[PDB]
Amino acid sequence: DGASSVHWFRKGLRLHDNPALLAAVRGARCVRCVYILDPWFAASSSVGINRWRFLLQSLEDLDTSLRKLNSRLFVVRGQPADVFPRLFKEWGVTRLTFEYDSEPFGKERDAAIMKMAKEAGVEVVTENSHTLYDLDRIIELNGQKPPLTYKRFQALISRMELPKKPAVAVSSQQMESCRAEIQENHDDTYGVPSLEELGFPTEGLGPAVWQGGETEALARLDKHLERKAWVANYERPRMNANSLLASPTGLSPYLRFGCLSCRLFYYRLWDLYKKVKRTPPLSLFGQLLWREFFYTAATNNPRFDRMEGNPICIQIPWDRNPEALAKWAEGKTGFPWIDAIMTQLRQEGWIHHLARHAVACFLTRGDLWVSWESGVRVFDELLLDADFSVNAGSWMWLSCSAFFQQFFHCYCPVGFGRRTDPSGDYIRRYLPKLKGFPSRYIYEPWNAPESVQKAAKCIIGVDYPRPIVNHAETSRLNIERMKQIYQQLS
Ligand SMILES: O=C1NCCN1C[C@H](O)Cn1c2ccc(F)cc2c2cc(F)ccc21
Numbered sequence: 001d002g003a004s005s006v007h008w009f010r011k012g013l014r015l016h017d018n019p020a021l022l023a024a025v026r027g028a029r030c031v032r033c034v035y036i037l038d039p040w041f042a043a044s045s046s047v048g049i050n051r052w053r054f055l056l057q058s059l060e061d062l063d064t065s066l067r068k069l070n071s072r073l074f075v076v077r078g079q080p081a082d083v084f085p086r087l088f089k090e091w092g093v094t095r096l097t098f099e100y101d102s103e104p105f106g107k108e109r110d111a112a113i114m115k116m117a118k119e120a121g122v123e124v125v126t127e128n129s130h131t132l133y134d135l136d137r138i139i140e141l142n143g144q145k146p147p148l149t150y151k152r153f154q155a156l157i158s159r160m161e162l163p164k165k166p167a168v169a170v171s172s173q174q175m176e177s178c179r180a181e182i183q184e185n186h187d188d189t190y191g192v193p194s195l196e197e198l199g200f201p202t203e204g205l206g207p208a209v210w211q212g213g214e215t216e217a218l219a220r221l222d223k224h225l226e227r228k229a230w231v232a233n234y235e236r237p238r239m240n241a242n243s244l245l246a247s248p249t250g251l252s253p254y255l256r257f258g259c260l261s262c263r264l265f266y267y268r269l270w271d272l273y274k275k276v277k278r279t280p281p282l283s284l285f286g287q288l289l290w291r292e293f294f295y296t297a298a299t300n301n302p303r304f305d306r307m308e309g310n311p312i313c314i315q316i317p318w319d320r321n322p323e324a325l326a327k328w329a330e331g332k333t334g335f336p337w338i339d340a341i342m343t344q345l346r347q348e349g350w351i352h353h354l355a356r357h358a359v360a361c362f363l364t365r366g367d368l369w370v371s372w373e374s375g376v377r378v379f380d381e382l383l384l385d386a387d388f389s390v391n392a393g394s395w396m397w398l399s400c401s402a403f404f405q406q407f408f409h410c411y412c413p414v415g416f417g418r419r420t421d422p423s424g425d426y427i428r429r430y431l432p433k434l435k436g437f438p439s440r441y442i443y444e445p446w447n448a449p450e451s452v453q454k455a456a457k458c459i460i461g462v463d464y465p466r467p468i469v470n471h472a473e474t475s476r477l478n479i480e481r482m483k484q485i486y487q488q489l490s
Helices: 019-025 049-068 080-091 104-119 135-141 150-158 172-177 214-224 227-235 252-257 262-277 282-298 322-330 336-348 353-363 372-382 388-398 415-420 425-430 450-455 471-487
Strands: 003-009 028-037 073-077 095-099 123-127
Touching (some): 019 028, 019 123, 028 080, 049 073, 049 214, 073 080, 135 282, 227 262, 252 282, 282 388, 322 353, 322 372, 336 372, 336 415, 353 372, 353 388, 372 388
Parallel strands (some): 003 095, 095 123
């Protein structure tokens, strides 16, 4: 008997490698794809324009793909626990499918939905295609606790099956054939909203730096895996000035929203390795494996993104310093390297991993001694590839709050920028107020003589702030403080 299925998009915003959507379609007489938009989400949230644009463009891409099959995405407004009982009744739903969510809050949401579906006679299929592995299997093999060091994680997955291959494509014919009739007034209720409807400024015609959606994700995957990009990205990567700019082959926002399947990426990367080198090392997959590591650590920890009550996080007496945090968040620290990175993050929504090391170091154990929790919140607002697991996980790792086995140094907020871009043009691009400084002073403009500041038409302390701390004194004190925190544990 043919099901009436609803496939629920949350992440996994794609039609390729979507085993949950396969389960919705197989043996269905009727299928509807829904995204549930909580109309009061923003009331509790301060998420910025770049993440909203990326989400909306991802939903518009799904709707465009569904229109090719004479169907539509249903953007249902409400909270899942409220709308699903109505949808079940009104649409006569017999099956609900969705990609598994490992994050503690989503797991609790989904468990409640599964209870309500069971009560209503609705079958539920979930598939764990957001990650490479069954995270619960990793934890099970580790004595029912997540690994807390990366080598242990690698040992565990090294005695597990390989990640599942990407699922086969849903039949275009099957999907158009089993579609729900779209009403002409679909957009009364179920349309994808425009950015201007969310109060954001009017969008231009030019493309975003990071255009959302599955179509863009797959085009980027293709370019990313061109042989001509193999040396630059996998054989001999270099952290140079050009690396700091958003790359047209970058995949991380698409992986985070599920516009790109991590299993597809994994096996296409393996395929390219085979062609070029004629069994790859684990390091080939490091980007995906570190992501999986943080997902595994997060899934059973509802306090993962907090310090207090987080069982894996050392309790550190961070300063309560809202003025410093606000300066850090707005790029007003007076360190042009830090400020340019935070400006790029706010303007575009992606910054290089080593630039994330730099600004997170400055906020937490390197300089300002503000809790990593506040850095998590700012990255959640602004960073396209941040989610509960990788954001908090990376901040705890970087700040030596969790996963600690050895100390590693924070980069210098002057020297690291100077080395990465000796030209200073990264600074000039994101902090044009500083553009007249010669490259000798542009990373440390408080050291420029008054003659140079006058000719650069930027007087430090007036047109651009003085550095908010003395880095040499502050970082040595902070190192001393952290060392004592850890050595005292004995
Ligand atoms: O470089 C290394 N070594 C081990 C892992 N890794 C890559 C990091 O995960 C990159 N990264 C993030 C990715 C997503 C996100 F939402 C937040 C962060 C983030 C926060 C930090 F404070 C510092 C690094 C950060």
